[PDB]
């Protein structure tokens, strides 16, 4: 269970995915295509034997080899390598590149103080590249442990990331102190942009 | 165990949501501190040819 | 066509036992080896198993050895993968695939969910808005188990500008999700934004209209 | 893996660790610094250890409990860790010092072990802040990927920089095929991505 | 003083054993319990087994739970760590510590275990060719277990000098790189030479590194 | 149970001292010699058995 490898290339650009087995595979090498969630697409068998369907632009020791001769908009996916006993590389997932574009931060009171927890939200919406760093304070004192994040899938309509940070502490804490903030740092942000509440409609 | 049903009519929630228990009674405290967190409350009013229990303002 | 439809997933404990079935449709599996792989949320595939039945051969994962069972039923055209001893590093979807000569089909996946929680429906709470330029909205999809939960706006009315994160498992042992939508905040006075919940696992089926402060 | 922060000498930063049950009051906190053995700081949730300084506080308030640190001092960026219930430790933080922004330095260096069937190639990054970077490869502007492994430094003890060490690594035959292999990188800190370039064999 | 050192650590094949020992020291382990506590490279820290050994209590994560045992010998003060049916999940660094009777007061120094096919490997040493500032290294590759060690000129130069972590390759033997920043008006007159340790396959080298 | 071999290095550039087990000094030769061929260390190469340590000098 480990993250696949990045790479960013805009459309045109030429691309060669690299698969290492330990020893001598012979010919039995495949290659598959995958897109977020769903199942994976074969493309190659046996190292360089193309598979029905996919387009002309697709080619393929103990180096084995995936070459995009032109790419397109419809290649944007992870790919994969197979070793015919059988183990699955890596993995490498191809990102669309484009313009930086920084973040629009909203901050969200927490609405579920009958749960006995309260969950604070700092919403980033719609920044370029991936890396986004939130960090959380309260009372100006930053603060860890307490949080968790998630991120979307690159948008197919203007490649765009988003991101989710929940703060979630017990009723008791939150109610002990006045100022929620989360500061954002990104590329495209010339400063650190915080976004803020004070408890109590202040 | 067997499976009740709440079946919840008000102002912004809406829908039906289930849970296992012993007894009716149990899946009624369950159901219960459901609505509470949502800020629902309303007329309770229990079925038990259907094991669903019913919250509406 | 060649399809392979799987099932047996779903809940159970730490060192508790689920069988998965791939009934195979188009061919008969005895010209045909059918592999078994798995993936996490967000991590990369793994290979688990794999049987041959015309030949007998059985092949599993080395992290599987003496707890899984690959089986194949002629008579019924469907190879199983009987899991036992399961802890929580298996917490994955599970694909039933099969093999001078590659995985060429893929089965629809199933879930597979080992944990002590029990099945649990989600908890719904608004995340509310702030005339004027833009505003955002959502609603938070709290303490629900096991995944997945499927989150609509206005039954699909609503999609542009709409971001329904993925779940994050929390140290409760329950998921949480958000899902918001950028919206021109000029709206907010008239316009109605709802909040469609879907849970089958628990089948619960709600919606939340979010309203400003 | 550890989770990250930024903190500058005088800031004020307070760790949380939550367990899904009731850990009483048995939370002990420690600190870890590179190559070191860990340390620990705080026992029973609030008790300190002797010879702890005076900015260490560990809490409780609710089955939340917390350690906080009153005025980050020079000494302190390290990785803090905590431990609850089956005793059982948080996936520890590493608190790194705020600083400028600086660009790297990219050196790049042909390969020299020819001889021994694979060719490697090593493009440096040195000295920039913040730690993420950007490299990527291209052969006959290609851009390539998979070939290649990254490794990082620690944070430095003067000057708070990090550097880059990436290794292209290719079969001689694959090797001997292309002409052209470059590293270009992408910083903040970079106004235009840098690429940095070689012609194989002294051209 | 209270010390406790560690031993026993080293290689050993998929399903091999190792057993590893933490001799007490300043105090009695009856007094105590004992815990062993490991550590993946860059990864966090995991509890694995602990023994208090005036109760007789086990106590085994579930990711250890029936392939290691955990003894005490009492007129030794030593603990000791059977682990078996060893396979790369367990590759980390070992930590004997004590808690005296909450919380773990003292540690261990840790100790190395490395489970895989390959066999020992002395490392290999490969210059990287310097050309303002110049920059030049060697690169210390295939080289099995951990660690090796670089230094330049034995020590003598700190300033500019990066040592960076291993990594790991598709052979399954490591490589890392050290480098050096220095002016390059010295490259005409001092000598840049890279020291190279790694005890685990008693190899000490030192290589010469002068421009292309 | 095999045996030990050492190489002492002794050239212009690389000076150390390496090891590795093995059958035969004849395998413990092959393993010296490409060990050298790859670092680029051609010499005259002195073996001696009461201590199972080859000698390549440059």
């Known amino acids: 269970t480990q993250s696949p490898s990045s790479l960013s290339a805009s459309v045109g650009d030429r691309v060669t995915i690299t698969c290492?087995?330990?020893?001598?595979?012979?010919?039995?090498?495949?290659?598959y295509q995958q897109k977020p969630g769903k199942a994976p697409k074969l493309?190659?068998?046996?190292?360089?034997?193309?598979?029905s369907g996919v387009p002309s632009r697709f080619s393929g020791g103990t180096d084995f080899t995936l070459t995009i001769s032109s790419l397109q908009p419809e290649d944007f996916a992870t790919y994969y390598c197979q070793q015919a006993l059988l183990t699955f590389g890596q993995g490498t997932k191809v990102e669309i590149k484009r313009t930086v574009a920084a973040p629009s931060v909203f901050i969200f009171p927490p609405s579920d103080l009958r749960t006995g927890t309260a969950s604070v939200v700092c919403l980033l919406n719609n920044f370029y590249p991936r890396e986004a760093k939130v960090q959380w304070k309260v009372d100006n004192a930053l603060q860890s442990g307490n949080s968790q994040e998630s991120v979307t899938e690159q948008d197919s309509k203007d490649s765009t990331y988003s991101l989710s940070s929940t703060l979630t502490l017990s009723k008791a804490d939150y109610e002990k102190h006045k100022v929620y903030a989360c500061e954002v740092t990104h590329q495209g942000l010339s400063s650190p942009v915080t976004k803020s509440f004070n408890r109590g409609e202040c | 165990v067997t499976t009740y049903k709440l079946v919840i009519n008000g102002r912004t929630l809406s829908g039906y949501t289930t849970t296992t228990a012993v007894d009716a009674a149990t899946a009624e405290k369950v159901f219960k501190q459901y609505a509470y967190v949502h800020e629902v409350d309303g007329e309770w009013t229990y079925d038990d040819a259907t094991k669903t229990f019913t919250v509406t303002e | 066509?060649?399809?392979?439809?799987?099932?047996?997933?779903?809940?159970?404990?730490?060192?508790?036992?689920?069988?998965?079935?791939?009934?195979?449709?188009?061919?008969?599996?005895?010209?045909?080896?059918?592999?078994?792989?798995?993936?996490?949320?967000?991590?990369?595939?793994?290979?688990?198993?794999?049987?041959?039945?015309?030949?007998?051969?059985?092949?599993?994962?080395?992290?599987?050895?003496?707890?899984?069972?690959?089986?194949?039923?002629?008579?019924?055209?469907?190879?199983?993968?009987?899991?036992?001893?399961?802890?929580?590093?298996?917490?994955?979807?599970?694909?039933?695939?099969?093999?001078?000569?590659?995985?060429?089909?893929?089965?629809?996946?199933?879930?597979?969910?080992?944990?002590?929680?029990?099945?649990?429906?989600?908890?719904?709470?608004?995340?509310?808005?702030?005339?004027?330029?833009?505003?955002?909205?959502?609603?938070?999809?709290?303490?629900?188990?096991?995944?997945?939960?499927?989150?609509?706006?206005?039954?699909?009315?609503?999609?542009?500008?709409?971001?329904?994160?993925?779940?994050?498992?929390?140290?409760?042992?329950?998921?949480?999700?958000?899902?918001?939508?950028?919206?021109?905040?000029?709206?907010?006075?008239?316009?109605?934004?709802?909040?469609?919940?879907?849970?089958?696992?628990?089948?619960?089926?709600?919606?939340?209209?979010?309203?400003?402060? | 893996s550890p989770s990250s922060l930024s903190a500058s000498v005088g800031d004020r930063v307070t760790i949380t660790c939550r367990a899904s049950?009731?850990?009483?009051?048995?939370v002990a906190w420690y600190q870890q610094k590179p190559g070191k053995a860990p340390k620990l700081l705080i026992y029973?949730?609030?008790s300190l250890y002797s010879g702890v300084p005076s900015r260490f506080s560990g809490s409780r308030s609710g089955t939340d409990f917390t350690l906080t640190i009153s005025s980050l001092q020079p000494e302190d960026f390290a990785t803090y860790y905590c431990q609850q219930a089956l005793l059982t430790f948080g996936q520890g933080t590493k608190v790194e010092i705020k600083r400028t922004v600086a660009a790297p330095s990219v050196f790049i260096f042909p390969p020299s072990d020819l001889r021994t069937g694979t060719a490697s190639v090593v493009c440096l990054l040195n000295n920039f802040y913040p730690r993420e970077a950007k490299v990527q490869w291209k052969v006959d502007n290609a851009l390539q990927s998979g070939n290649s492994q990254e490794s990082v430094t620690e944070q430095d003890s003067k000057d708070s920089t990090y550097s880059l060490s990436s290794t292209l690594t290719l079969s001689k035959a694959d090797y001997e095929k292309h002409k052209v292999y470059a590293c270009e990188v992408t910083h903040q800190g970079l106004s235009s991505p840098v690429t940095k370039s070689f012609n194989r064999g002294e051209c | 003083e209270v010390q406790l050192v560690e031993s026993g650590g080293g290689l050993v094949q998929p399903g091999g054993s190792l057993r590893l020992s933490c001799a007490a020291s300043?105090?009695?382990?009856?007094?105590?319990?004992i815990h062993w506590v490991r550590q993946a490279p860059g990864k966090g820290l995991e509890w694995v087994a602990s023994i208090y050994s005036y109760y007789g209590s086990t106590s085994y994560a579930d990711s250890v739970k029936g392939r290691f045992t955990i003894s005490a010998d009492t007129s030794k003060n030593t603990a000791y760590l059977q682990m078996n049916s060893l396979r790369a999940e367990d590759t980390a660094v070992y930590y004997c510590?004590?808690?005296?009777?909450?919380?773990?007061?003292?540690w261990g120094q840790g100790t190395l275990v490395t489970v895989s096919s390959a066999s020992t490997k002395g490392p290999s040493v490969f210059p990287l060719a310097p050309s303002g500032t110049a920059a030049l290294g060697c690169l210390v590759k295939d080289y099995f277990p951990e660690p090796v060690t670089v230094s330049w000129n034995s020590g003598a130069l700190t300033s500019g000098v990066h040592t960076f972590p291993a990594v790991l390759q598709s052979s399954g033997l490591y490589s890392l790189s050290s480098v050096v920043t220095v002016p390059s008006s010295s490259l005409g007159t001092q000598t840049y030479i890279c020291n190279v340790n790694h005890k685990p396959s008693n190899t000490k080298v030192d290589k010469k590194v002068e421009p292309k | 149970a095999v045996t030990t071999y050492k190489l002492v290095i002794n050239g212009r550039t690389l000076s150390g001292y390496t090891t590795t087990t093995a059958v035969d000094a004849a395998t413990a030769e092959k393993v010296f010699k490409q060990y050298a061929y790859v670092h680029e260390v051609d010499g005259e190469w002195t073996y001696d058995d009461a201590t199972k340590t080859f000698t390549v000098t440059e």
């Open positions: 510590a004590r808690e005296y009777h909450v919380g773990l007061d003292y």
């Open positions: 049950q009731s850990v009483s009051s048995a």
């Open positions: 029973s949730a609030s």
């Open positions: 300043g105090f009695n382990l009856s007094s105590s319990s």
